[PDB]
Design an enzyme around this catalytic site. Structure first.
Site, PDB file in Angstrom:
ATOM      1  N   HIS B  42       0.605  -1.319   0.063  1.00  0.00           N
ATOM      2  CA  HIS B  42      -0.027   0.196  -0.039  1.00  0.00           C
ATOM      3  C   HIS B  42       0.771   1.301  -0.082  1.00  0.00           C
ATOM      4  O   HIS B  42       0.190   2.415  -0.163  1.00  0.00           O
ATOM      5  CB  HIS B  42      -1.041  -0.009   1.030  1.00  0.00           C
ATOM      6  CG  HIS B  42      -0.694   0.811   2.276  1.00  0.00           C
ATOM      7  ND1 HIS B  42      -0.586   0.112   3.566  1.00  0.00           N
ATOM      8  CD2 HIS B  42      -0.598   2.196   2.494  1.00  0.00           C
ATOM      9  CE1 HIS B  42      -0.162   1.265   4.251  1.00  0.00           C
ATOM     10  NE2 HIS B  42      -0.386   2.321   3.748  1.00  0.00           N
ATOM     11  N   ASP B  88      -0.820  -6.932   2.619  1.00  0.00           N
ATOM     12  CA  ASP B  88      -0.119  -5.427   2.520  1.00  0.00           C
ATOM     13  C   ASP B  88       1.463  -5.881   2.581  1.00  0.00           C
ATOM     14  O   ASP B  88       2.105  -5.814   3.637  1.00  0.00           O
ATOM     15  CB  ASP B  88      -0.712  -4.595   3.668  1.00  0.00           C
ATOM     16  CG  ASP B  88       0.037  -3.050   3.768  1.00  0.00           C
ATOM     17  OD1 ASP B  88      -0.169  -2.248   4.219  1.00  0.00           O
ATOM     18  OD2 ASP B  88       0.824  -3.058   2.321  1.00  0.00           O
ATOM     19  N   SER B 185       4.831   3.272   7.882  1.00  0.00           N
ATOM     20  CA  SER B 185       4.437   2.065   7.104  1.00  0.00           C
ATOM     21  C   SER B 185       5.502   1.582   6.214  1.00  0.00           C
ATOM     22  O   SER B 185       6.241   2.288   5.411  1.00  0.00           O
ATOM     23  CB  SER B 185       3.240   2.413   6.333  1.00  0.00           C
ATOM     24  OG  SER B 185       2.019   2.253   7.049  1.00  0.00           O
ATOM     25  N   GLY B 186       5.638   0.236   6.380  1.00  0.00           N
ATOM     26  CA  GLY B 186       6.371  -0.327   5.192  1.00  0.00           C
ATOM     27  C   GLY B 186       7.920  -0.596   5.880  1.00  0.00           C
ATOM     28  O   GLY B 186       9.055  -0.758   5.075  1.00  0.00           O
TER      29      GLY B 186
END
Ligand code: NA
Lengths: 51, 235, 74
Positions: B42, B88, B185-186
């Site tokens: 995402h 994700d 995120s990530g």
């Protein structure tokens, strides 16, 4: 029995015919002692630098 | 991150920063190997071009250590779900390859079984990234890491106002003001085992940051372990 | 980097505006999930402080009880 202390294996501990058998992440190779892992490289994954 | 501490030099080397066309970091990534970065499916939905900076510690300043790798190709997991961040996960293969050095080394992928049994049953893991420092705070100009306790599933499931699929897991505090947040995120969630760091999760989503009664939720990498391999075949 | 107003805060990622409580309300069945992304995926946007609906007309974030002004142009 892996569950005592990961079968004293430094990384992947497992069981083969009731014998824990240590192993390692790519980059490493199992010391002769069958417990530890010797980086077969300068930047083995997972170890921080400063070293 | 929301409260932890800057990674000292050498401390968070598998950390990667995905950056926009304006050099602004918008997500993270875990350095898997010289040509590969693990990120969250995402972070890459807007679509425009982006790069990869390994080696950074302070962002208001360039100062050697850094390096921008051009993405050569990206592999989004194919069952992802914007609606719910399921699957994700995604890998990036760099055009050129990373030069491991101080502050720049990869993180190890664990062996599923060992991970599920020995790793994910450790008391905590370590989230890390350039994210805002408060739910309504600003992005951190410095790289920060945070130790986050594994939260039990139903305990996770019942605290979330959204689906916790088995491709995801929970981590953090019920109440303590420490959690990962926007911009994180990530990033890597790595669990340590005897001075080795194994990638155990990816910074996915979450209701607010540090909110009482809520955990941060992470992609359970230990379930895209084979996915990650095939993903590195891409020919 | 928009300059926020009394009662709005600065979302240096924007992903949060989509979820502002809107004055003449009536909420989605599922909030924009973009709001739960931990990525810094959009440009900074002034969005309502917790506990401030956005009066639809006067572009502002007021308390709840203050959602009410009628517009017309000339
Ligand atoms: Na909390």
């Amino acid at each position: 029995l892996c569950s005592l202390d990961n079968g004293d294996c430094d990384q992947f501990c497992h069981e083969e015919q009731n014998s824990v058998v240590c192993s390692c992440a790519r980059g490493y190779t199992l010391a002769d002692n069958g417990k530890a892992c010797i980086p077969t490289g300068p930047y083995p994954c997972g170890k921080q630098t400063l070293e | 991150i929301v409260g932890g501490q800057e990674c000292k030099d050498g401390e968070c080397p598998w950390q990667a920063l995905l950056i926009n066309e304006e050099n602004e970091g918008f997500c993270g990534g875990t350095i898997l190997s010289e040509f590969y970065i693990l990120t969250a499916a995402h972070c890459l939905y807007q679509a425009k071009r982006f790069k990869v900076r390994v080696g950074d510690r302070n962002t208001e300043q360039e100062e050697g250590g850094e390096a921008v790798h051009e993405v050569e190709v990206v592999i989004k997991h194919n069952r992802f779900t914007k609606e719910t961040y399921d699957f994700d996960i995604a890998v990036l293969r760099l055009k050129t390859p990373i030069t491991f050095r101080m502050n720049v080394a990869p993180a190890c992928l664990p062996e599923r079984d060992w991970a599920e049994s020995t790793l994910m049953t450790q008391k905590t893991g370590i989230v890390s990234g350039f994210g805002r420092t408060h739910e309504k705070g600003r992005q951190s100009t410095r790289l920060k890491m945070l130790e986050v306790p594994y939260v039990d599933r139903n305990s996770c499931k019942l605290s979330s106002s959204f689906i916790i699929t088995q491709n995801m897991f929970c981590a953090g505090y019920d109440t303590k003001q420490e959690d990962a947040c926007q911009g994180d995120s990530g990033g890597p969630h790595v669990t340590r085992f005897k001075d080795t760091y194994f990638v155990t999760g990816i910074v996915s989503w979450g209701e607010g940051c540090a909110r009482k009664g809520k955990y941060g939720i992470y992609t359970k990498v230990t379930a895209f372990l084979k996915w990650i391999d095939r993903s590195m075949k891409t020919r | 980097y928009p300059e926020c107003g009394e009662n709005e805060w600065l979302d240096d990622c924007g992903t949060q505006k989509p979820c502002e409580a809107k004055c003449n309300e009536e909420p989605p069945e599922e909030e924009d999930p973009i709001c739960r992304s931990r990525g810094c995926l959009l440009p900074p946007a002034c969005v309502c402080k917790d506990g401030f609906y956005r009066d639809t007309v006067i572009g502002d974030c007021v308390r709840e009880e203050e959602c009410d002004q009628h517009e017309i142009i000339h």
